[PDB]
């Protein structure tokens, strides 16, 4: 895509802290940018839309190539259109923002500068953030995660992408998403079909795959961390059934693991660790700190901080596994007890370590789920089962919760706040903020 400038693009600022093992942290000045899919796409030389509702212009976008020629991405009014605002080290995303049109949620990337996403090498380092999920009911997900995107959002690889990271291009994840309007410098017009239940979205012929580290998939009721390896580490186009994921004859037919090896303390049998009010170890009505450590072996350690108390990830027992570190033994035991071989089939932690050894881009988002009502996160899934099937219960939300129309209507003012991001060698982020 090219970029037009009826709405000049200025990214909201966000400070964060970079820490050293020698005991110090110092302030970094970043900023956030909204993903291309949330942007107005119009004719390069007028206000006529190329994409409107959930379908492309037949006159302007007959094929991928003509569409990319005729059309452009424009800038975002972050606060007034998208309900995205920042203050110091704090970022808030509103759920439903009503302007001239209704906007639902957002997906944002942390930038190093105006034209470059911030790349983090996670392996051997730790990532800490604060989060307030108190305004997130069943069905919502304030996600913080990492994907193997290119720093320039694909500019050096695709001559017809001139918008780049400045306009939030280059998204990929382990779902190999086909709902993207631009992939690899080109419009996803060919094979586009409008969603049957979403007035604003659809599915194209092509998708965009890469490695995904889900640090935080969470609302006030449930939280999970999930690792998704792919056979090609970085961003790659896929076509149709080649994409696997949600849309394909074979969910598992693509280069990525869509399921992931997950750790949800509730799903694992600890139902008093995380929830709203004083009866939980972590009280979700209040801000909490989440720290994630990437052991050089490829294992993962997790701790939390609330009201100045440090809580380890609760010990879990599963098959032959016992402990609180996400390692090879945990992920094998999870498949053994809960079923599936997707994670292992795609190379497991060894493959995933290839992603964490390179750069990954930080993503912060807020969404509802038009495919599965977020039930896989916070409820019983699939819904025909009870807690008799191991792994089926992931949270205490009713199986009739999370319908998008319902939550968009009842909780339009829901929101997530991410703040106080800190990154450095393992053991370093507890150091005094700069
Ligand atoms: C932003 O960072 C990129 C990536 O190295 C660099 O090439 C570019 O010159 C930078 N822009 C500015 C204004 O510093
Ligand atoms: C669009 O179509 C062309 C040629 O048919 C294809 O090579 C390209 O990868 C497609 N791009 C997208 C984003 O779907
Ligand atoms: C849940 O985790 C908390 C905090 O670590 C712990 O005190 C408690 O014993 C755990 N409960 C179960 C059922 O394992």
């Amino acid at each position: 895509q090219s970029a037009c400038t009826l709405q000049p693009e200025t990214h909201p600022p966000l400070t964060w802290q970079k820490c050293s093992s020698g005991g110090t942290c110092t302030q970094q000045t970043g900023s956030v940018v909204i993903d291309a899919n949330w942007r107005w796409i119009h004719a390069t030389n007028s206000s006529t839309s190329c994409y409107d509702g959930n379908t492309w212009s037949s006159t302007l976008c007959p094929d991928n190539e003509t569409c990319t020629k005729n059309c452009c991405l424009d800038g975002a009014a972050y606060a007034s259109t998208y309900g995205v605002t920042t203050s110091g080290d704090s970022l808030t995303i509103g759920f439903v923002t009503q302007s001239a049109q209704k906007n639902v949620g957002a997906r944002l990337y942390l930038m190093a500068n105006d034209t470059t996403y911030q790349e983090f090498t996670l392996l051997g380092n730790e990532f800490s953030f604060d989060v307030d999920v108190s305004q997130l009911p069943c069905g919502l997900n304030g996600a913080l995660y990492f994907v193997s995107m290119d720093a320039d959002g694909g500019v050096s690889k695709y001559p017809t992408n001139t918008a780049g990271a400045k306009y939030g291009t280059g998204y990929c994840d382990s779902q190999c998403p086909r709902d993207l309007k631009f992939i690899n410098g080109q419009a996803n017009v060919e094979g586009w079909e409008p969603s049957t239940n979403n007035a604003n979205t659809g599915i194209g012929g092509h998708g965009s795959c890469c490695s995904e580290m889900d640090i935080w998939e969470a609302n006030s009721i449930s939280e999970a961390l999930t690792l998704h390896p792919c056979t090609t580490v970085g961003q790659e186009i896929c076509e149709g059934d080649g994409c696997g994921g949600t849309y394909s004859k074979n969910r598992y037919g693509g280069p990525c693991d869509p399921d992931g090896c997950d750790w949800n303390p509730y799903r694992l049998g600890n139902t008093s660790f995380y929830g709203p009010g004083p009866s939980f170890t972590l009280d979700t009505t209040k801000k909490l700190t989440v720290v994630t450590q990437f052991k050089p072996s490829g294992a993962i350690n997790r701790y939390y901080v609330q009201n100045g108390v440090t809580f380890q990830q609760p010990n879990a027992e599963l098959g032959s596994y016992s402990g609180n570190e996400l390692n090879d033994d945990y992920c094998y035991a999870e498949e053994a007890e809960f079923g599936g071989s997707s994670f292992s089939d795609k190379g497991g932690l060894t493959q995933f370590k290839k992603a964490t050894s390179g750069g990954m881009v930080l993503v912060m988002s807020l969404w509802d789920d038009y495919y599965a009502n977020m039930l896989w996160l916070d409820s019983t899934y699939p819904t025909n089962e009870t807690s008799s099937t191991p792994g089926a219960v992931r949270g205490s939300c009713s199986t009739s919760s999370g319908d998008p129309a319902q939550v968009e209507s009842q909780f339009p003012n829901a929101k997530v706040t991410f703040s106080n991001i800190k990154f450095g060698p393992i053991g370093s982020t507890g150091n005094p903020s700069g």
Side-chain angles (χ1 to χ4, degrees), residues 265 268-274 281-282 311-316:
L268 287 178
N270 200 320
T271 64
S272 69
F273 181 67
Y274 178 89
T281 301
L282 301 173
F311 298 97
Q312 299 295 107
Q313 187 83 298
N315 282 328

Side-chain angles (χ1 to χ4, degrees), residues 366-398:
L366 177 55
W367 54 291
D368 56 3
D369 174 9
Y370 278 74
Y371 176 71
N373 290 1
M374 221 65 76
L375 303 168
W376 52 270
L377 183 52
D378 60 31
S379 181
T380 301
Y381 196 72
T383 49
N384 67 29
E385 291 158 39
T386 66
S387 57
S388 66
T389 320
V393 174
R394 309 99 188 286
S396 63
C397 295
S398 147

Side-chain angles (χ1 to χ4, degrees), residues 287-310:
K287 195 178 66 177
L288 69 143
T289 293
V290 179
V291 186
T292 303
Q293 304 179 318
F294 299 82
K295 274 183 79 222
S297 69
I300 297 167
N301 290 315
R302 160 63 62 77
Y303 72 89
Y304 309 82
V305 191
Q306 191 169 66
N307 191 43
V309 186
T310 300

Side-chain angles (χ1 to χ4, degrees), residues 192-213:
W192 186 267
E193 300 302 327
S195 294
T196 181
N197 61 347
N198 194 319
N200 298 302
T201 69
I203 299 294
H206 290 82
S208 184
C209 305
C210 63
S211 298
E212 183 179 346
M213 174 71 207

